[PDB]
Design a protein around this ligand. Structure first.
Ligand SMILES: [Ca+2]
Ligand SMILES: [Ca+2]
Ligand SMILES: [Ca+2]
Ligand SMILES: [Ca+2]
Ligand SMILES: [Ca+2]
Ligand SMILES: [Ca+2]
Ligand SMILES: [Ca+2]
Ligand SMILES: [Ca+2]
Ligand SMILES: [Ca+2]
Ligand SMILES: [Ca+2]
Ligand SMILES: [Ca+2]
Ligand SMILES: [Ca+2]
Ligand SMILES: [Ca+2]
Ligand SMILES: [Ca+2]
Ligand SMILES: [Ca+2]
Ligand SMILES: [Ca+2]
Ligand SMILES: [Cl-]
Ligand SMILES: [Cl-]
Ligand SMILES: [Cl-]
Lengths: 151, 151, 152, 165, 152, 151, 153, 152, 151, 151, 152, 151
């Protein structure tokens, strides 16, 4: 189960960075739609926190060792962060979230595949459920942005 | 529509088609305002289901037989449905809902008049209460569209 | 690529819409001993069906599909058949009719399960699996009230 | 001297005005509550587990109508009947001794007949109030008539019949 | 002369019914400073009385008895006396009236306790003990409002 | 629906002043009964606020323009205010609330009559329901003062 | 010792409640016939109540210095109730009659518990049996009424 | 000893009453994209204003003062200006109006803080501090919707 | 019922002192187990307060006069208090609670007997119920201390 | 009371005696108004317990040792207790509560001053919040008694 | 036919019933530091075990099977062995016993997952996957309390 | 208000790292006490998140720009992270949390000081409330460890 543990830990790092990025969007948001999207980022952060709980606990349960320092999150995550900026528009902010979500969904697909190969059905299900809700958020964010989900 | 039972059945049919149109709007919606109006359509659907509950039950109680098949609903309703289209703008979608609600308000006024003439006070109140809430929604939808209610 | 998953999801949209209509008819026209228990039960079943429609229509949209969204489309595309309401149908007959609709839906869900699996769409696969599980549990209970085994 | 004291039969009845019908409702609802409670206690037969607690729900609904109508009567300056003697003597519903050997169909039919009477009384109260222009009282009777009639449909459906209002 | 538990339970059915009626009268005809607090309290007392009625009638039926279930039986079997409602009674007179009814109920509950105890019917015994405890607590509060000791 | 709109706006004005008077009674109350009636005035204010919501919204819904400045409320209201005074007795305060309520009940009856004549059944029901509740309050307030409702 | 009998009847109850729970579960599972929708979940309510008595009686036994039976074999061997294989063909009315019989037994067992604990001066244990008996007897009345009969306690 | 603390609390009583009236106007007359979220939001703001009114009026009465309690007193003592309701105002101008009212209240609360701090009335001082914090947080949000920095 | 009133009042005093001891244990607790037992003392204080409500109210209802000053509580209670001391171990603090509870249970048995002798069944049940729960706690505390209840 | 810890402990003692006095009032009350004031005393006791929680915990947190025996509360409190008396009038009882509350508010002001002096801002806030609420109660109690707060 | 899916569901009915009994024993006989947190935790574990029994027995009935439903059947078909209750067992030994019971259940659920997957009974397969996931999470926690790795 | 803003941002960084450390402790915990302290870390994280919300929001409100990347949190925080280790004893873990909390409390005192000095009363209150709760946790954590708070 080496690869299942590896992708779960990858998720630990990526979810940590994704939560940070979402927090930035939440904080620096400006433009029409703020009142609805500002708290929505908070909802998205709670959902990301949720996946982190599920995945980190599964990794520990499997005898793994979750990344657990900002240095490890940053260095292992494939997501890049930039300085907060109030001048970013609402469309740009939402587009950035969509792109973070597409990355997460692809990671979850890899997680699904890897765990399926090793026969780790519990881990497999964790990734399937997370991927489903994230893809649903992509649909809604894309709809707000006037586009098809284009998964 | 010669009596109370008849207008009640007309309502069962129109409310059923109205529910379907609302669902279409809910599903095919795209554009800024999606996050607010997509779930709002679900509230409107719940409200419509509520009137269908009141009116169908009253019809049954009066010894009537409610239309209870999609064919009957579609054929007896005076509302017309068209294929779903993601390209309809958010504002055109809301304008469509307003048209549907104006029709229902007029239907309810007719039910009010008919039941009143026949002295069916219970049925009369049902239409009055439904008309009141529907008209209030017309005001809010029109306001979002930057217009007066124009009842 | 997911065209078949999309088609079966849309098939479910049509069938679930017709099933909801049939359940409403049973709810309304029901008469006989047991009415007080089963009339409100139909409302629970309608909420359940609505839930499946939400899950499947949203997944279809998410996959880039276009859900049927008019009564004519639901009626023409659904394999279920509707009949005019009739107060003389017995309680047993009404429950048997619901069982028939539920067996059809359970069969439809197995089909959705199979198609999604074949196209590698695991999210859609799970949606059908969860819906099949709950609807089959209802068949057991309905059949039980009817003094019969589930006979899946 | 002192004023002579009139000695006459009460008679009356006469559901002349809103206050009179509201008070008639106070009496009829009180006896109806008692009858429902009897059906509740003496019920036996298949279906007991569902209809026994249902009578309790019907009792609560009756209690509610009693609250609305008695309070409106007081608000109008009336004096509600408030003794079992006044309830029993003024109500047109007839009570009999409780009996455990009545089928469910028979119990439910009795409730339906009690409800048909109340719906009729409510229609009378609606007509009288409307004629007097007492719109508040008018709405009270209309609302109670509506729910009571819905109950008749359900009870009748259990009995395998149409509402037949 | 209440021979057994069934007899005192049925006596309570009648007495609780009349007490409820009296409480309702006080609720309706109340006038004076304190109305805003005591008018609704009467409703609480009625609900409590209802509770005892539920517990005692159900126990009687469970024991194979037949509860009084008509106003005629309640009125005639009850020892409580009703009078026509009158808005000219003071708040303090109304409360004293309630205390009287409660003292009567408490005495009846003691009888039920003694009778059930002699019989060895501990279930019925507890019902009377519980009802008695709460009724006496109310007498204390009512009397306190009236500037008096409980004087049980 | 000229008159209906006019009496609805009259109510907007009167309900706004009535709320102010209730608040005064709430704040300046002193004497035995304070603990019960002080919080009760807050309940009354909420009910008045509720009628204000129903009536102003219906007026907007009908194409009207609700009074929405303190100047308009004071000048259009038939209710008169006086400086707060802690020396008014509890019973005088309650009598004051009763007079305000008798006025509103009268206004609601007029609103009912006007709306009924113009055939505005939704407006008519709003006034009827508000009158029903205000009159119940009058009975209770009078009962506390040891009097009959005297509607 | 002084409370040897109370402890023994509490333990007898632990065994009988455990087997009664098993029987109720069987009725819940194998039920078929008109009335299933109302009685199937009702059995679940009864199981919850039975479970509640087991909590009360086992805890009091432990509190008194006893050792509760806590293995299926002890439950089965000490209980006076007999179990039979599940059977879908038992009628709804036969199933309810069976529950009535189990309850009549529990009610009598609780009466013994009451008598024994009362004789030993264990008032706490006495009240526990009294409250349980009261509810089970109310259930016998309702089950019997559904079956068209008097409680016949 | 607390003359100025009482004066500023009473100033708040008038200003909050007028601010409430202005918020109600914005609530009623609002038209434009965003109505569905900002219309209800105005009711939230009105409830918060009511809250401040409750706190400040009660503190004033508690300190032995006499709160303004007539529309005339509110109107004449408040420094906020009201104008006739107008449906033709844009959503964005309505929100800009709300921001102005809030900037004013936040300034008044700062005055309330300074004055009460000067007289050593710590309870009153905390009331103004807590109120100022929330109003300021609302200014940030409103400004953000309007694409601007809070600019306190 | 002189004896029943007397034992009830004795309970008022002992429960008042027991509440103080429990509060002391709550405040001065130090050692492994603090996090679970500190809030537990709060639950015990609440239960004790409840018994005080029941017993003091019953005494008043019987025409008695409850002790209602710290002096009366201290002088009538058979429980002895000592100065708070952080040096007491968790296990000793729990053993002290057990000691107080054994006393309370013994007291309640005496109240049960006295009331039973005088025929005061209401008071009798109040003591029986309090005794039942206090003894259940003794079992649990003792179990935590690796011992049998030893009632 | 030379420091924050000393004044916090003084409050522990005074709050303990205040609770006892409020309980006495709750138990011995007789007279019109009982039904509303008897339960109100329970609310006040709950509020008093709340201040005790906050102050005792803060003292412990600062390294102090709270008074934790009835002897300490009674001897350290500046409040005096007398035997319960059913003949005290309702008004007299409420006036007694007012005097206890005036003492507590005065003590809280001293705690506020001492802590502010020592720079202990956390403790300072605790006294400020408690003073705010007790003064509010004094206003309502005085109001029921037909008087101004007279702080 | 789903022969083996039905057999493993019934094996679980037996094993869950015995596991519930063992957990109840640990619950009752527990003594030692940690009792206050672990005694009620056992109740939580029993409720969860109970839930799995509900799910698995219902699925078996739904599939046309016949759940074991007598203590004798549970005891004779279960692979778990029970011993007499003993208060002298330490807290840490009790938790270790629970871990052993849970390791067995987790293995049982893995077996049910594989068998159901083999036969194409995806509904049953999901039930076992869910149950296995939670039981394994508990093993991690229990082991952690015991100062050890999960060692699944 | 430059220094208030600076200390608020320092807190954003320190709170972010503190959250990460708490999470590590939560995940890697092993030893008797796990079942109570594992969930407790979750409560602490939630509380830490709350301060982050209050402080980041106030910083934005004052015209500041909050650190919003893991790199900034890690580089600006004075707290140091180490690789997760399952062998560390429970008592060692709790001692580590105490050290993080002692640092946070000192940080909040500094924040209180700079804001008081600048006249920024709102920010001052935020640090005061947060310092209060953190110090309360230090007492409990120390108590579990058999020690005085030693603030
Ligand atoms: Ca958050
Ligand atoms: Ca929906
Ligand atoms: Ca529905
Ligand atoms: Ca038929
Ligand atoms: Ca009832
Ligand atoms: Ca017959
Ligand atoms: Ca009532
Ligand atoms: Ca208010
Ligand atoms: Ca269950
Ligand atoms: Ca059969
Ligand atoms: Ca509002
Ligand atoms: Ca406490
Ligand atoms: Ca209390
Ligand atoms: Ca096989
Ligand atoms: Ca349990
Ligand atoms: Ca968390
Ligand atoms: Cl039939
Ligand atoms: Cl059958
Ligand atoms: Cl360790």
């Amino acid at each position: 189960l080496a690869d299942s543990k590896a992708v779960l830990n990858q998720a630990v790092a990526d979810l940590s960075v994704a939560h940070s990025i979402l927090h930035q969007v939440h904080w620096y948001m400006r433009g029409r739609g703020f009142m609805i999207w500002h708290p929505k980022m908070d909802e998205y952060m709670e959902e990301i926190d949720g996946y982190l709980d599920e995945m980190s606990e599964r990794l520990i349960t499997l005898g793994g060792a979750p990344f657990s320092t900002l240095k490890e999150f940053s260095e292992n995550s494939q997501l890049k962060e930039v300085l907060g900026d109030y001048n970013v528009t609402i469309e740009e902010q939402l587009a950035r979230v969509v792109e973070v979500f597409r990355y997460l969904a692809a990671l979850f697909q890899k997680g699904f595949d890897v765990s399926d190969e090793e026969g780790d059905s519990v881990t497999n299900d964790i990734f399937n459920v997370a991927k489903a809700s994230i893809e649903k958020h992509i649909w809604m964010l894309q709809a707000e942005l006037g586009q098809a989900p284009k998964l």
